[PDB]
Design an enzyme around this catalytic site. Structure first.
Site, PDB file in Angstrom:
ATOM      1  N   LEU A  13      12.557  -1.207  -1.978  1.00 47.28           N
ATOM      2  CA  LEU A  13      12.740  -0.206  -0.957  1.00 47.28           C
ATOM      3  C   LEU A  13      12.575  -0.783   0.677  1.00 47.28           C
ATOM      4  CD1 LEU A  13      11.888   2.944  -2.706  1.00 47.28           C
ATOM      5  CD2 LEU A  13      14.042   2.033  -2.216  1.00 47.28           C
ATOM      6  N   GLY A  14      11.597  -1.632   0.585  1.00 48.74           N
ATOM      7  CA  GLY A  14      11.294  -2.344   1.850  1.00 48.74           C
ATOM      8  C   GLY A  14       9.872  -3.011   1.771  1.00 48.74           C
ATOM      9  N   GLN A  15       9.245  -2.668   3.080  1.00 45.60           N
ATOM     10  CA  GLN A  15       7.992  -3.116   3.585  1.00 45.60           C
ATOM     11  C   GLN A  15       6.941  -2.011   3.971  1.00 45.60           C
ATOM     12  OE1 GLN A  15       7.990  -6.534   2.101  1.00 45.60           O
ATOM     13  NE2 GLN A  15       6.566  -6.890   3.588  1.00 45.60           N
ATOM     14  N   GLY A  16       5.908  -1.725   2.977  1.00 47.21           N
ATOM     15  CA  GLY A  16       5.306  -0.673   3.218  1.00 47.21           C
ATOM     16  C   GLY A  16       3.920  -1.259   4.117  1.00 47.21           C
ATOM     17  N   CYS A  17       2.935  -0.441   4.368  1.00 45.24           N
ATOM     18  CA  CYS A  17       2.060  -0.774   5.240  1.00 45.24           C
ATOM     19  C   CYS A  17       0.967  -1.913   4.769  1.00 45.24           C
ATOM     20  CB  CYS A  17       0.807   0.629   5.403  1.00 45.24           C
ATOM     21  SG  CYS A  17      -0.120   0.498   6.917  1.00 45.24           S
ATOM     22  N   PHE A  18       1.022  -2.461   3.574  1.00 45.91           N
ATOM     23  CA  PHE A  18       0.269  -3.232   3.095  1.00 45.91           C
ATOM     24  C   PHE A  18       1.013  -4.280   2.173  1.00 45.91           C
ATOM     25  CE2 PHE A  18      -2.803   0.296   3.657  1.00 45.91           C
ATOM     26  CZ  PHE A  18      -3.416  -0.275   4.721  1.00 45.91           C
ATOM     27  N   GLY A  19       2.030  -3.939   1.406  1.00 42.84           N
ATOM     28  CA  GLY A  19       2.708  -4.706   0.683  1.00 42.84           C
ATOM     29  C   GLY A  19       4.257  -4.301   0.658  1.00 42.84           C
ATOM     30  N   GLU A  20       4.762  -4.700  -0.419  1.00 43.81           N
ATOM     31  CA  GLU A  20       6.187  -4.137  -0.592  1.00 43.81           C
ATOM     32  C   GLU A  20       6.291  -3.168  -1.563  1.00 43.81           C
ATOM     33  OE1 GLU A  20       8.351  -7.728  -1.787  1.00 43.81           O
ATOM     34  OE2 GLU A  20       8.018  -7.513  -3.797  1.00 43.81           O
ATOM     35  N   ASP A  78      -3.404   7.542  12.061  1.00 47.02           N
ATOM     36  CA  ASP A  78      -2.223   6.780  12.183  1.00 47.02           C
ATOM     37  C   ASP A  78      -1.033   7.702  11.938  1.00 47.02           C
ATOM     38  OD1 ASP A  78      -0.407   5.028  13.015  1.00 47.02           O
ATOM     39  OD2 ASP A  78      -0.496   3.756  11.307  1.00 47.02           O
TER      40      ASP A  78
HETATM   41  C1  6G3 Z   1       9.024   1.937   1.731  1.00 42.20           C
HETATM   42  C2  6G3 Z   1       8.734   3.294   2.073  1.00 42.20           C
HETATM   43  C3  6G3 Z   1      10.027   4.025   2.575  1.00 42.20           C
HETATM   44  C4  6G3 Z   1       8.180   4.055   1.095  1.00 42.20           C
HETATM   45  N1  6G3 Z   1       6.609   4.032   1.236  1.00 42.20           N
HETATM   46  C5  6G3 Z   1       5.997   4.738   0.403  1.00 42.20           C
HETATM   47  C6  6G3 Z   1       4.561   5.063   0.110  1.00 42.20           C
HETATM   48  C7  6G3 Z   1       3.908   5.334   1.073  1.00 42.20           C
HETATM   49  C8  6G3 Z   1       2.468   5.485   0.979  1.00 42.20           C
HETATM   50  C9  6G3 Z   1       1.893   4.856  -0.199  1.00 42.20           C
HETATM   51  N2  6G3 Z   1       0.398   4.904  -0.186  1.00 42.20           N
HETATM   52  C10 6G3 Z   1      -0.352   3.730  -0.329  1.00 42.20           C
HETATM   53  O1  6G3 Z   1       0.000   2.446  -0.125  1.00 42.20           O
HETATM   54  N3  6G3 Z   1      -1.779   3.888  -0.379  1.00 42.20           N
HETATM   55  C11 6G3 Z   1      -3.021   3.113  -0.400  1.00 42.20           C
HETATM   56  C12 6G3 Z   1      -4.134   3.577  -0.590  1.00 42.20           C
HETATM   57  C13 6G3 Z   1      -5.371   2.810  -0.771  1.00 42.20           C
HETATM   58  C14 6G3 Z   1      -5.160   1.330  -0.488  1.00 42.20           C
HETATM   59  C15 6G3 Z   1      -3.851   0.721  -0.306  1.00 42.20           C
HETATM   60  C16 6G3 Z   1      -3.970  -0.497  -0.250  1.00 42.20           C
HETATM   61  F1  6G3 Z   1      -4.272  -1.088   0.866  1.00 42.20           F
HETATM   62  F2  6G3 Z   1      -4.444  -1.102  -1.334  1.00 42.20           F
HETATM   63  F3  6G3 Z   1      -2.220  -0.933  -0.282  1.00 42.20           F
HETATM   64  C17 6G3 Z   1      -2.826   1.750  -0.213  1.00 42.20           C
HETATM   65  C18 6G3 Z   1       2.562   4.320  -1.283  1.00 42.20           C
HETATM   66  C19 6G3 Z   1       1.910   3.786  -2.440  1.00 42.20           C
HETATM   67  C20 6G3 Z   1       2.812   3.128  -3.283  1.00 42.20           C
HETATM   68  C21 6G3 Z   1       4.098   3.189  -3.281  1.00 42.20           C
HETATM   69  C22 6G3 Z   1       4.813   3.650  -2.148  1.00 42.20           C
HETATM   70  C23 6G3 Z   1       4.151   4.171  -0.914  1.00 42.20           C
HETATM   71  C24 6G3 Z   1       7.132   5.479  -0.353  1.00 42.20           C
HETATM   72  C25 6G3 Z   1       7.102   6.391  -1.348  1.00 42.20           C
HETATM   73  N4  6G3 Z   1       5.913   6.940  -2.027  1.00 42.20           N
HETATM   74  N5  6G3 Z   1       8.285   6.960  -1.879  1.00 42.20           N
HETATM   75  C26 6G3 Z   1       9.468   6.725  -1.392  1.00 42.20           C
HETATM   76  C27 6G3 Z   1       9.405   5.530  -0.158  1.00 42.20           C
HETATM   77  N6  6G3 Z   1       8.357   4.929   0.256  1.00 42.20           N
END
Ligand code: 6G3
Length: 258
Positions: free
Chosen positions: A16-23, A129
């Protein structure tokens, strides 16, 4: 830990893309459950550090917060949550759906987000944020808060003095209201980061967006009060937005964009 699942129970199907920490991938869990899957590159966080951070997602449960489903907490780390089929709110607003959205839909999205944050508020947490890029959209215009922690979204006491509170999230929510009513434009158009903080300290605030009712811009201005204690609660913001077209703008008429 009971959040742990085996690696073979996951299938990553579409990137899907690039999330806040990984892909991030769209995938399947246990062969039956549609899920979003995030992968962290082995270099990014220790398993010990990760479990402390993921503790929040394990604590908080609300219909307007993206819901954690499972984790693989050894490197390489996997994070599994509910799938939000429309991606980020920011992309949603900018993309093909944007032109059909009018004020009733956008205010409803705002009300959902405020509902999510009111839960965060009742739990005595802080997001830090809040902005459209960290809101996810699903079917039926469902909106959910994601990615718990960008000067243009940040309250001056937070940016300047590190005072991050639920009230600085309220400031951010006000900025998010302009993203909604402009279909995703960057706030303070034509102003760079450096101008923003200085301008805001001297009292500058964004004006009423075109076709946005004055009463909704007044709510923004309430979110952007200099004294954080004078800003409304999310409980107040939720109620105001849910009731908006009866109590505040009973005579609303559709326009070209809002
Ligand atoms: C790429 C975009 C459009 C997208 N991001 C997420 C998405 C958002 C937020 C999260 N939450 C998250 O990363 N939580 C955390 C909590 C503690 C520590 C960490 C980390 F630092 F280890 F990454 C991450 C996700 C987690 C796991 C998987 C996805 C997402 C989703 C989604 N869920 N559905 C559709 C599209 N999405």
């Amino acid at each position: 830990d009971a959040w742990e699942i085996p690696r073979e129970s996951l299938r990553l199907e579409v990137k899907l893309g690039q999330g806040c920490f990984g892909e991030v991938w769209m995938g399947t869990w246990n062969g039956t459950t549609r899920v979003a899957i995030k992968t962290l590159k082995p270099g990014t966080m220790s398993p010990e550090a990760f479990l402390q951070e993921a503790q929040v997602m394990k604590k908080l449960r609300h219909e307007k917060l993206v819901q954690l489903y499972a984790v693989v907490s050894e490197e390489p780390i996997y994070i599994v949550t509910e799938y939000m089929s429309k991606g980020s709110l920011l992309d949603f607003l900018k993309g093909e759906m944007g032109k059909y959205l009018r004020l009733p839909q956008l205010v409803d999205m705002a009300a959902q987000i405020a509902s999510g944050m009111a839960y965060v508020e009742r739990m005595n947490y802080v997001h830090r944020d809040l902005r459209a890029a960290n809101i996810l959209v699903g079917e039926n215009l469902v909106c959910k808060v994601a990615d718990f922690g960008p000067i243009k979204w940040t309250a001056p006491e937070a940016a300047l003095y590190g005072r991050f509170t639920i009230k600085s999230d309220v400031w951010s929510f006000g900025i998010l209201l302009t993203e909604l009513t402009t279909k995703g434009r960057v706030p303070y158009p034509g102003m760079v980061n450096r101008e923003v903080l200085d301008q805001v300290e001297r009292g500058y605030r964004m004006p009423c967006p075109p076709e946005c009712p004055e009463s909704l811009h007044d709510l923004m201005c309430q979110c952007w009060r200099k004294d954080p204690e004078e800003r409304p609660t999310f409980e107040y913001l939720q109620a105001f937005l849910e009731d908006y077209f009866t109590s505040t703008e009973p005579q609303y008429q559709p326009g070209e964009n809002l």
